[PDB]
Design an enzyme around this catalytic site. Structure first.
Site, PDB file in Angstrom:
ATOM      1  N   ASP A 151      49.188  48.137  20.162  1.00 40.77           N
ATOM      2  CA  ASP A 151      47.815  48.442  19.778  1.00 40.77           C
ATOM      3  C   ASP A 151      47.838  49.135  18.416  1.00 40.77           C
ATOM      4  OD1 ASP A 151      45.039  48.664  19.782  1.00 40.77           O
ATOM      5  OD2 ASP A 151      45.009  50.443  21.071  1.00 40.77           O
ATOM      6  N   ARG A 155      43.261  53.973  13.956  1.00 41.88           N
ATOM      7  CA  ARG A 155      43.104  55.076  14.897  1.00 41.88           C
ATOM      8  C   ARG A 155      44.436  55.596  15.425  1.00 41.88           C
ATOM      9  NH1 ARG A 155      42.052  57.362  20.210  1.00 41.88           N
ATOM     10  NH2 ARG A 155      44.223  56.632  20.162  1.00 41.88           N
ATOM     11  N   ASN A 156      45.480  54.768  15.403  1.00 42.02           N
ATOM     12  CA  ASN A 156      46.798  55.123  15.915  1.00 42.02           C
ATOM     13  C   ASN A 156      47.802  55.406  14.817  1.00 42.02           C
ATOM     14  OD1 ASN A 156      46.322  55.117  18.661  1.00 42.02           O
ATOM     15  ND2 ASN A 156      46.488  52.867  18.754  1.00 42.02           N
ATOM     16  N   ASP A 169      51.684  56.925  19.174  1.00 40.96           N
ATOM     17  CA  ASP A 169      51.399  56.236  20.428  1.00 40.96           C
ATOM     18  C   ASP A 169      52.028  54.848  20.464  1.00 40.96           C
ATOM     19  OD1 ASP A 169      50.132  58.436  21.344  1.00 40.96           O
ATOM     20  OD2 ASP A 169      48.094  57.632  21.298  1.00 40.96           O
TER      21      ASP A 169
END
Ligand SMILES: *[C@@H](O)c1nc(NC(=O)Nc2cc(O[C@H](C)c3c(Cl)cncc3Cl)c(C#N)cn2)c(OC)cc1Br
Length: 289
Positions: A151, A155-156, A169
């Site tokens: 993913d 945002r990560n 993450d």
């Protein structure tokens, strides 16, 4: 629950602070993370279990911790610092990134008659290229460690006080066989819009499906934190992906960078660049500017 002396950190050397997000992640002060400076304060992020606390949740955090231990250190990932596993709740202590995730960093820094710099926003083209380059280098490291993110998204990626990009993450149980494709996060994100077609349609994940996602992240960067496939509902995204549709070239984006995005989105995973090739292609642009 067995003791690992290489990574164990005494929990009484942590002072938990304000939560960062939701397992759940809490900001904390750590004393003596460097055993040569036992009273020195540092700021860290502490991953822990929520109050729900199901056996599957614990297994997932333990699994993340074990991926953390074997991934090794790199400048462009969130690195493991220690763990608390004895006589108390399970903590996974990682680096803290003072500026938040890359999407919020960009959106807060979008360009704006007081003083001589009225038109000058905080973000310049070479710094945006540097952000992309650093994410590619971190991804290249993760791929060589046989880590698929699954993913990868702005945002990560987290941003340090020195504007270093750190992939976050990356070693997570992602619920691959039960994704709610229509699921929207509390901040409005539709994570299906970062999935490679082979991941979406066939549940197949490789480093090249991460390259697809990196392409979407590149678009996020050069829209200064825009949401991908703007205004495309999930039902419509399915059909356009089946038809081979791609996002348009965003405004004020040089064709070098949109070209790289379109390579990242080639239908055949073998026709996408590798992360090693993306690092080189981005390095050439960074140096030139
Ligand atoms: C510590 O330097 C610090 N961090 C932040 N902000 C922040 O996001 N720190 C942070 C967050 C991390 O993960 C969280 C769950 C997260 C968020 Cl909040 C948002 N998007 C993705 C993720 Cl993964 C991690 C990790 N791992 C590390 N650091 C501050 O914001 C004000 C302040 C400080 Br001092």
């Amino acid at each position: 629950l067995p003791l690992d002396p290489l990574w164990e950190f005494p929990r009484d050397r942590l002072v938990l602070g304000k939560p960062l997000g939701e397992g759940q992640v809490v900001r904390a002060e750590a004393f003596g993370m460097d055993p040569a400076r036992p009273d020195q304060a540092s700021t860290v992020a502490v991953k822990m279990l929520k109050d729900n606390a199901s056996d599957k949740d614990l297994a997932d955090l333990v699994s993340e911790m074990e991926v953390m231990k074997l991934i090794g250190r790199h400048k462009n990932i969130i690195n493991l610092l220690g763990v608390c596993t004895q006589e108390g709740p399970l903590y996974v202590i990682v680096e803290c990134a003072a500026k938040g995730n890359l999407r919020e960093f960009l959106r807060a820094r979008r360009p704006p008659p007081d003083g001589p710099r009225s038109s000058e926003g905080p973000l310049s083209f070479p710094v945006l290229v540097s952000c992309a380059y650093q994410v590619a280098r971190g991804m290249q490291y993760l791929e060589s460690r046989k880590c698929i993110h699954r993913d990868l998204a702005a945002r990560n990626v987290l941003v340090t006080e020195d504007n270093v990009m750190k992939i976050a993450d990356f070693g997570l149980a992602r619920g691959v066989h039960h994704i709610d494709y229509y699921k929207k996060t509390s901040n409005g994100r539709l994570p299906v819009k970062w999935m490679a077609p082979e991941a979406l349609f066939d549940e197949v994940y490789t480093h090249q499906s991460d390259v697809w996602s990196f392409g979407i992240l590149l678009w996020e960067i050069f829209t200064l934190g825009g949401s991908p496939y703007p205004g495309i509902p999930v039902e419509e995204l399915f059909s356009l992906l089946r038809e081979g549709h791609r996002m348009d070239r965003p405004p004020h984006c040089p064709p070098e960078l949109y070209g790289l995005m379109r390579e990242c989105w080639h239908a055949a995973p073998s026709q996408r660049p590798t992360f090693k090739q993306l690092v080189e292609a981005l390095d050439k642009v960074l140096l030139a500017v």
